Swiss-Prot record:
Cross-link Glycyl lysine isopeptide (Lys-Gly) (interchain with G-Cter in ubiquitin): where in chain: K24
Organism: Homo sapiens
Record's protein name: Induced myeloid leukemia cell differentiation protein Mcl-1
Residue span of motif BH1: 74-94
Chain location of the short sequence motif BH3 per the record: 31-45
Self-association state and partner proteins as the record states: Interacts with HIF3A (via C-terminus domain). Interacts with BAD, BOK, BIK and BMF. Interacts with PMAIP1. Interacts with BBC3. Isoform 1 interacts with BAX, BAK1 and TPT1. Heterodimer of isoform 1 and isoform 2. Homodimers of isoform 1 or isoform 2 are not detected. Isoform 2 does not interact with pro-apoptotic BCL2-related proteins. Interacts with RTL10/BOP. Interacts with BCL2L11; may sequester BCL2L11 to prevent its pro-apoptotic activity. Interacts with GIMAP5 and HSPA8/HSC70; the interaction between HSPA8 and MCL1 is impaired in the absence of GIMAP5.
PTM annotation: Cleaved by CASP3 during apoptosis.
Result, substituting K56R: No effect on ubiquitination
Gene that encodes it: MCL1
Role of this protein: Involved in the regulation of apoptosis versus cell survival, and in the maintenance of viability but not of proliferation. Mediates its effects by interactions with a number of other regulators of apoptosis. Isoform 1 inhibits apoptosis. Isoform 2 promotes apoptosis.
Family statement drawn from the similarity comment of this UniProt entry: Belongs to the Bcl-2 family.
Subcellular location: Membrane; Cytoplasm; Mitochondrion; Nucleus, Nucleoplasm
Amino acid sequence: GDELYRQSLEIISRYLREQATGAKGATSRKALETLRRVGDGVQRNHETAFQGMLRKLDIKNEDDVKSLSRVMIHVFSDGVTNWGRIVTLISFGAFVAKHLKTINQESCIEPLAESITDVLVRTKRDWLVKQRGWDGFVEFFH
Ligand SMILES: Cc1cc(OCCCc2c(C(=O)NS(=O)(=O)c3ccccc3)[nH]c3ccccc23)cc(C)c1Cl
């Protein structure tokens, strides 16, 4: 097993889907409430950049969402790894998730999640371990 990966995918998965479907172990549940508060804050403050980036990505179907990976890696990894940019990575994900339910492609949400987790855990794995993973996440937005 890879429990940072499956915890990461569980949290990002349900955060994205509840964000698009309106709504809605113990560590995963505190991370998810943290990521509601912070997540919705960030989507409201970067909303001008977020819609700029959404419209420029132009996601229509699920082969779009599968292309997204390496532009994700590009925008995301600028070395100086920190929770702020991680949570922006997830929250933009949510932004995209609600836009995919608008155009009635909820089927792409879980691939999208599977991509975000996939970028995150594979590009920051050592940093995330050194910060005790999602317990670091929760206690950083304490
Ligand atoms: C699901 C998905 C997520 C993606 O995340 C990218 C990194 C997060 C991000 C920043 C960002 O990091 N901006 S920043 O350098 O000024 C920054 C760094 C730390 C805390 C707050 C802001 N600006 C953004 C503007 C628009 C969209 C996302 C961001 C990227 C892609 C392609 C997809 Cl398909």
